[PDB]
Design a protein around this ligand. Structure first.
Ligand SMILES: Nc1ncnc2c1ncn2[C@@H]1O[C@H](COP(=O)(O)OP(=O)(O)OP(=O)(O)O)[C@@H](O)[C@H]1O
Ligand SMILES: [Mg+2]
Lengths: 51, 578, 468, 471
């Protein structure tokens, strides 16, 4: 009973939690990349005001 | 007026030039087709306009004309029994011009200018009027529509038209300074209508559902939020509230959802009867429909139009219930507009001012004393559609800070056809304490004790559910098995409610009270009989258990006799038992 | 009309090129790009201003240069030529034939974007459609005018189920009365990102059945440019709407894979530098998906109808993935395939527990069909839920914690699947299946049938398993 | 001066910002008044000035403003508030204007609202024990006079009731300290940010019933008020509190309703200017901005007055690692954290003892202040409750029947502790009652388990039975 309980309840919940945390971290990384791209564009556009 | 030309087109965003003198948040007319747009940014000689219609086919150089006024709705007689677009256009007057399809550019007045209304004056020359006072009355479908002075008007009365039949655009009262008061007036949708004072909500809002009326009540000026994943039952719950509640006027806002859910309401409502006046159900309902395939920028305006109309009906003394079908679509529209403006997002792409907008929308609800000296109320029930059932998303978390009740739906119950599928462990209500004096005089004097006892039984069963899942139901003793079976009886016979059944769809307070009393009487008798060595098997096989299960299908006119017979049978069958 | 050409190309990078002095280019127009070699590419204006216009190209930009390239205008609104004679033809997903037959002559030219339907002009979908599959027609019945997707897996037979439904779809105008007349039927088939093997299998099935004579195929292969995948379902829905609302046809629309459409949408959106959404998909994917699924339904005062059955696959069976989650918020139900039922050899592997049909209540009932249909369905749902629950209890605790009452639930749950769900290539009926549904409810006691009224219990209770 | 200069030539309006070009004579941080075409006047503040153009944030909404008729005029170089001793018993909005219908006050001084830092040499150690009447606060998480003790709440949890009860029952015990003089009632400064009508009405009725509105000052910023006004309200409230406390020897208790709304307004302004974000989009300077508010409480050597702060904030999704609770915990001196599990069981007040903290607890307790057995009893209670929680975790795996005879005592101790020490309701308890109940609970455990209590205290106090009190 203990073996079946572990293999049928405990492991899949931990796997789902791991997947959820990975998705959240990846989304935050993508948002950071977008922000850095925007401010790089701003920096490049600043120098072109008067050449 | 201020007049210019189009400089740049990109989706629903149009940049006009030559617009020096235009004001923020005004209404502009874009292009030769006469589309409707709103200023949201001024920059030198240019202006940023978001268009509420389809922008395909526009060309650079078309004129833009600024009307100089903000977005406003027309408030007056003729709004009931109506279906409106996102910017208050009558759909039935559009179909007669354009066919089965919706084409941009069609302009129709919101209030019909050809109908004649019976006029009855109540003021006399020489009187002085203020904002919110009543000038006269006009009959509607059972109601008595009152003609109100606009909130910004003050002066003395010079001449009043006598009784008769007039259109909505004929002046009825002329003041001393030459101001003419008609049967209708316009109000900006982004300004809350003024009131004298706000009162503490103290009377319940009866929804007709047992779980929402007993366990998690909502008052007559409160706000409630019902989040859940797809297929949970938000729309069915809101439509049952529209069908069976005790509100005088119901305003339904279909913000960004399916078109079949509006056709069902338009078709089935005229054949139903409202609970309090006996007339057609559609005679008290106002629909604002903006489906998912309509222009996105019109989703934001529909919420403000609906809440402004609901506030207008509040000023006449009625009790108005407002149902917003989805606020996440409004959040998506805000995200789209912010992306077009190229603003920096806060979380999930949403603009950082979303919580302020949500708090400004929900704050318009409440029980007030109107400027005319009457009492009115507005209740708001908004539904949230979180992506994938995640309750940590920004829209859900920004709503929990202002609402007074939180009805959480569950996918596990909805998958097993256990409706209304309300999670009774994650839900709460903050109006329970204030509504107790009403219950102590309007249903019975022992109602709160009964409700608390049943809540305690549910808590005990939920506690035992951890034990039973690892040892099985047989290994528990009789005192625990009794609690398990009683909790199952409560779950399958009291909380569950079919919204499509002929009788079970609506439940009064006294019927639920009687079911509660019967269940607890059975529990007490079984608890007494357990100590005499009687087996659980002998108790669970008793025929009186089926009387509890079938109790919710008895009509209201036959319930007290059934209740008396069931109580006598409960008190007798255990006496017959050993 | 005589053409006009622009040569003011000032910037090319990736899929975007900028055109100078493009004042008279309308927004959203369709353009033709020609280079020095004479090859012609497609493009669409996505942003226009006083200084330049921005055009995204329908395919790769190799060979373009700022000297010899010219851009011309095709039409301000993208349109498709339609005709009644398209029945039996095949198209590549852009409107051009691929069967070697001469091109059709356009009766009308309609915009492929379409227009929203007025909610007043609609009416209630109220007609039952016999799919030929028992687990659908009883518990999750399909109503004419519904959009009912199928939630598949990565190794589950969804294409075969779709082909069987397309072969066995009928109108059955006998039980609710209706017109009692021989009614025309049509199937519009659209495939996005399909492979060569699946293409051959689909065309072979349609030819062997003989259903090709009343069908139109919009087949888009996986090696085609990705824009032709985007426009594929819109042209199919344009053809379906034209047929249904100008010739009183009852059309059926099948979309093979929405996941490829979503991945193409993400790839297109990422090339325009837009803020991503939940898993990198664009934030406006809800609106883009809604503009497709909302073109089905029925219209008051007309005889035709449009019914959509999209098929999509859940990556790693994740029901919380953005694509199935956003699809479920628009459509009116779902049919979910179960991998565990497929593991034991049951075909079709439809799981009744997470399946749902929202328009069931008005498509079945008194006079429309057998009177007992709704109570039969909900009692079967409750009993199956209880049986699977106690079966999951047994798999941990063991058989020692079972009384005969729970053993009856176990026997019912084990019984249901092999008699009702497994059907192979059969073409069963509705009155056939209702007796089988009543038979399985006979083993449980009368007291378990709380929801069913005493009248329906009294009339029909008691029958053994009728599988022979 | 006594002259007004109008800067016409606005070139940009979007969101909460507004640009005026030829306005190089405006000082940084100055206050301006924005005049509409129809005569309406709205406030503003300069946040960046240059010889090219100046950047102005607008407090109210921007509806109706146009680039042709709008003008900007200067009010004062430094943002200042006119305070007085007669403002007790009044009500104000978020920017200090009266809303109670009474005529405006006459200022005795005009103080800057940004404040100035306190010299650490001039400070003194807070050592006055405050008896709040709650056992989980008086015994385990003692609050001293001059402390910043925020309340970490949730969505549906009753933080407002706890704050009102603390404000109602707060008193010092001069007989135990050895002073013996007549204490004065606490003056209350109440600052609201984005508060709803329900909570505002509850607070107003509570203050009316207690009769404390004659000693209270109220700054109210409702939910329908403009969002950017929330930047100024805590600064005005703390300016008034500091003035009263360090110029008239008042004992001031300051309550801030919701710091989350302040953080939302700060995020709106920071994202408008596109600063480098911290975590979850909040600006990088949020730590300094929050520190300029909390650090204005304390006690000053050579003066009788004091300032005590009780911020209230709601943790989103009950997440302790969210940036707002994280920074608030890094700045303040402890927290009182509410538990939803205790709230679902009907226990009021639902204060969770384990995640709570009080840094200044050791200064105010001990011999000559409360009693000599305070700290050891607190430590032993904490250790025993932690053991009980761990055994509760174990019985979810092995079952309670498989326990030894030792762990059942800890389990019953945890249950009785939650049911008796924490669940006290609306009654007021003295420190002696709470210590008596705590010693009654500790007598359930064997005498040999009390490793953190000196044997003298065990001999003096152990042995009482709980049935003499709650029997
Ligand atoms: N109270 C109820 N009684 C009976 N059946 C119900 C009830 N509530 C929901 N259902 C069933 O569940 C379905 C849920 O549909 P509904 O439109 O209410 O869901 P929803 O949560 O609003 O969905 P969506 O997010 O897709 O808009 C109904 O069509 C019906 O079949
Ligand atoms: Mg819905």
């Amino acid at each position: 009973r203990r073996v079946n309980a572990l293999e049928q309840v405990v492991i899949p919940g931990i796997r789902a939690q791991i997947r959820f945390i990975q998705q959240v971290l990846e989304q935050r990384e993508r948002e950071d990349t977008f922000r850095l791209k925007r401010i790089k564009g701003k920096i490049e556009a600043r120098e072109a005001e008067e050449e | 007026m201020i007049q210019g030309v189009i400089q740049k087109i990109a989706g629903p965003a149009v940049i006009a030039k030559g617009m020096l003198g235009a004001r923020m948040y005004d209404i502009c007319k874009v292009g030769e087709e006469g589309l409707v747009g709103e200023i949201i940014r001024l920059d030198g000689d240019t202006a940023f306009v978001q268009v509420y219609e389809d922008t395909s086919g526009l060309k650079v150089g078309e004129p833009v004309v600024s009307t100089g006024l903000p977005l406003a709705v027309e408030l007056g007689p003729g709004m009931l029994n109506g279906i409106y677009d996102g910017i208050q256009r009558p759909l039935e007057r559009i179909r007669e011009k354009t066919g089965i399809y919706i084409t941009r550019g069609v302009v129709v007045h919101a209030l019909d200018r050809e109908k004649k209304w019976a006029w009855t004056p109540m003021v006399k020359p020489g009187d002085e009027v203020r904002g919110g006072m009543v000038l006269g009355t006009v009959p509607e479908f059972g109601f008595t529509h009152k003609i109100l002075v606009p909130p910004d008007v003050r002066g003395r009365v010079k001449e009043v038209k006598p009784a008769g039949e007039y259109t909505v655009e004929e002046p009825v009262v002329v003041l001393e300074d030459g101001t003419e008061l008609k049967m209708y007036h316009t109000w900006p949708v982004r300004r809350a209508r003024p009131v004298q004072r706000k009162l503490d909500p103290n009377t319940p809002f009866l929804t007709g559902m047992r779980i929402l009326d007993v366990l998690f009540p909502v008052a007559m000026g409160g706000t409630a939020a019902i989040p859940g994943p797809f297929g949970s039952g938000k729309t069915v719950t809101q439509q049952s509230l529209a069908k069976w509640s005790n509100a005088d006027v119901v305003v339904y806002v279909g913000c960004g959802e399916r078109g079949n859910e509006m056709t069902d309401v338009l078709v089935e409502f005229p054949e139903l009867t409202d609970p309090k006046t006996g007339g057609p159900l559609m005679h008290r309902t106002v629909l604002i429909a903006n489906t998912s395939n309509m222009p996105v920028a019109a989703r934001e305006a529909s919420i403000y139009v609906g809440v402004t109309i609901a506030e207008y009906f509040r000023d006449q003394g009625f009790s108005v219930a407002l149902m917003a079908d989805s606020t996440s679509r409004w959040a998506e529209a805000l995200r789209e507009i912010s992306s077009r403006l190229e603003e920096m997002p806060a979380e999930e792409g949403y603009p950082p001012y979303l919580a302020a907008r949500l708090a400004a929308f929900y704050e318009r609800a409440g029980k007030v004393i109107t400027l005319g000296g009457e009492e009115g109320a507005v209740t708001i029930v908004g539904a949230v559609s979180p992506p994938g059932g995640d309750m940590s998303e920004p829209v859900t978390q920004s709503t929990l800070r202002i609402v007074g009740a939180f009805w959480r739906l569950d996918a596990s119950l909805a998958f097993r056809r256990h409706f209304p599928a309300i999670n009774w462990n994650g839900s709460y209500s903050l109006f329970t304490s204030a509504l107790d004096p009403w219950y102590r005089e309007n249903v019975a004097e022992d109602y709160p004790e009964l409700r608390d006892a049943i809540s305690e039984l549910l808590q005990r069963e939920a506690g035992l559910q951890e034990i039973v899942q690892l040892v099985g139901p047989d290994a528990l003793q009789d005192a625990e098995r009794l609690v398990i079976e009683v909790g199952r009886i409560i779950r399958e016979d009291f909380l569950q409610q079919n919204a499509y059944h002929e009788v079970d769809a609506y439940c009064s307070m006294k019927k639920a009270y009687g079911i509660m009393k019967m269940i607890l009487a059975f529990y007490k008798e079984a608890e007494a009989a357990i100590k005499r060595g009687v087996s659980i098997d002998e108790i669970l096989q008793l025929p009186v258990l089926e009387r509890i299960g079938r109790a919710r299908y008895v009509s209201e006119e036959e319930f007290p006799a059934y209740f008396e017979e069931a109580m006598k049978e409960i008190q007798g069958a255990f006496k017959a038992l050993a | 009309l005589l053409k006009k050409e622009y040569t003011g190309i000032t910037y090319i990078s990736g899929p975007l090129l900028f055109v100078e002095n493009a004042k008279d280019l309308a927004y959203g127009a369709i353009v033709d790009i020609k280079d020095g070699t004479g090859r012609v590419r497609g493009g669409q204006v996505i942003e226009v201003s006083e200084e330049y216009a921005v055009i995204q190209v329908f395919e790769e930009t190799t060979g373009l240069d700022l000297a010899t390239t010219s851009v011309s205008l095709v039409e301000d609104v993208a349109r498709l030529g339609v005709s009644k004679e398209m029945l039996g033809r095949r198209f590549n997903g852009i409107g051009k034939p691929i069967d070697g037959l001469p091109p059709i002559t356009p009766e009308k030219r309609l915009p492929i974007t379409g227009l929203p339907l007025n909610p007043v002009a609609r009416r209630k979908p109220e007609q039952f459609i016999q799919t030929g599959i028992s687990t659908i027609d009883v518990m999750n019945t399909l109503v004419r005018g519904q959009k009912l997707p199928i939630f598949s897996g990565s190794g589950l037979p969804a294409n075969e189920i779709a082909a069987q439904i397309a072969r066995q779809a009928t109108v059955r105008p006998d039980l609710s009365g209706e017109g009692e007349k021989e009614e025309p039927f049509a199937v519009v088939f659209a495939a996005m990102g399909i492979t060569q093997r699946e293409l051959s299998y689909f065309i072979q099935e349609f030819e062997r059945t003989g259903a090709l004579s009343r069908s139109v195929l919009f087949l888009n292969k996986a090696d085609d440019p990705t824009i032709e995948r985007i426009l594929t379902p819109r042209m199919a829905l344009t053809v379906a709407e034209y047929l249904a609302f100008e010739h009183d046809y009852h059309v059926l629309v099948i979309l093979t894979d929405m996941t490829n459409y979503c991945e193409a949408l993400r790839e297109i959106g990422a090339a325009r530098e837009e803020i991503p959404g939940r898993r990198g998909y664009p934030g406006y994917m809800y609106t883009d998906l809604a503009t497709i699924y909302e073109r089905a339904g029925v219209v008051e005062g007309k005889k035709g109808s449009v019914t959509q059955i999209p098929i999509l696959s859940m990556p790693d069976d994740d029901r919380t993935h953005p694509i199935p989650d956003l699809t479920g918020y628009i459509t009116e139900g779902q049919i979910q395939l179960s991998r565990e039922l497929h593991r034991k050899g049951i075909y079709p592997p439809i799981d009744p527990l997470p399946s749902l049909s929202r328009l069931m209540n008005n498509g079945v009932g008194k006079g429309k069909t057998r009177e007992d249909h709704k109570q039969v369905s909900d009692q079967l749902y409750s009993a199956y839920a209880n049986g699977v629950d106690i079966r999951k209890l047994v798999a941990i605790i063991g058989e020692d914690a079972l009384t005969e009452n729970d053993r009856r639930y176990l026997q019912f749950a084990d019984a249901f699947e092999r008699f009702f769900i497994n059907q192979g290539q059969q073409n069963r009926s509705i009155e056939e299946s209702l007796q089988i549904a009543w038979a399985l409810l006979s083993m449980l006691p009368q007291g378990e049938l709380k929801r069913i009224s005493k009248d329906h219990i009294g009339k029909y209770y008691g029958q053994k398993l009728e599988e022979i």
